[model samples]
Target: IVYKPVDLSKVTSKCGSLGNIHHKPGGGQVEVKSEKLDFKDRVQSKIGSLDNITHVPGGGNKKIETHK
Candidate 1:
């Protein structure tokens, strides 16, 4: 078979400008983004929040045992 004559100018024009092509995966459900939670809100959601408590269990002050 005889190959058709190709025009480089026409091919380039038809192809147009280069741009980002986003290809989404075709399956199941799309991913959902989550909100950022602070330490206070996170504690409150789980164990109803907290602060500096005096005489708490295992809250003893200890000295660092280190040598230079």
Candidate 2:
């Protein structure tokens, strides 16, 4: 579980843009790819009362959600 092999192109970063990293010594999670997070399309809302949720997008009441 000791893993440290990050090239990241000669390791040059003053701040952001490392976007994909999953370090695993115990736990790790980092994933963002909604158009490089400039932001486009990702919304969710749910209630466990009926299990009613499905495919689609916004407008016309907008209660769209999806997953695997």
Candidate 3:
């Protein structure tokens, strides 16, 4: 991951306080801390599915994968 300091005041306010805005050559995912509980729950629900599994301890490790 790449990191850089930015001026938060320069960002346009949309949903909430946008921080660490990132843009790829086309488009990419962002790491955001939602300001509201509903947003947080929604985002968690979306990403949480990938980690859910029914197995013994560490048995699901082989099913996980990462992309570049």
Candidate 4:
């Protein structure tokens, strides 16, 4: 699947409460609580600064290796 950036401008209070806030497959959610620019920056920074080599796919398995 291809991922596209989020459009924060269209977010509204009527959209209801922001759901779950954890980073789990098919369950991760992000809630923007700042202005559009800052929110975008925060999101981009979090994603951009991620370690690309951490996630590796093996035979019928996927593993995420990282240094703490």
| Root-mean-square deviation of every model | 29.2, 25.7, 23.9, 24.6
Residues 1-68 of candidate 1: C-alpha lDDT, one tens digit per residue = 66566445321122323464547534454455559944644342323233323343543444444433
Alpha-carbon runs more than 4 Å astray in model 4: 1-24, 36-44, 47-52, 55-68
Q: Give the TM-scores of the predictions, in the order they appear.
A: 0.14, 0.13, 0.15, 0.17
Candidate 3 wrong stretches, greater than 4 Å: 1-27, 38-44, 48-68
Question: Model 4, poorest ten-residue lDDT window?
Answer: 47-56
**What alpha-carbon RMSD in Å does predicted model 1 have with respect to the real structure?**
29.2
List model 3 lDDT by residue over 4-31, tens digit each: 5554443232442335443543434546
Top lDDT model: 2
Residue-wise C-alpha lDDT for candidate 2, range 1-68, written one tens digit per residue: 67656534343323333355545434235454445434367867443333423443432333444444
Q: lDDT per prediction? A: 0.41, 0.42, 0.41, 0.41
Off by over 4 Å in 2: 1-26, 36-42, 45-68
Candidate 2 colliding pairs, count: 0
| Candidate 4: tens digits of C-alpha lDDT, residues 1-68 | 66666544432232322464546334345564656543434343352232323332432534454442
Model 4 pairs whose backbones collide: none
Each model's backbone clash number? 0, 0, 0, 0
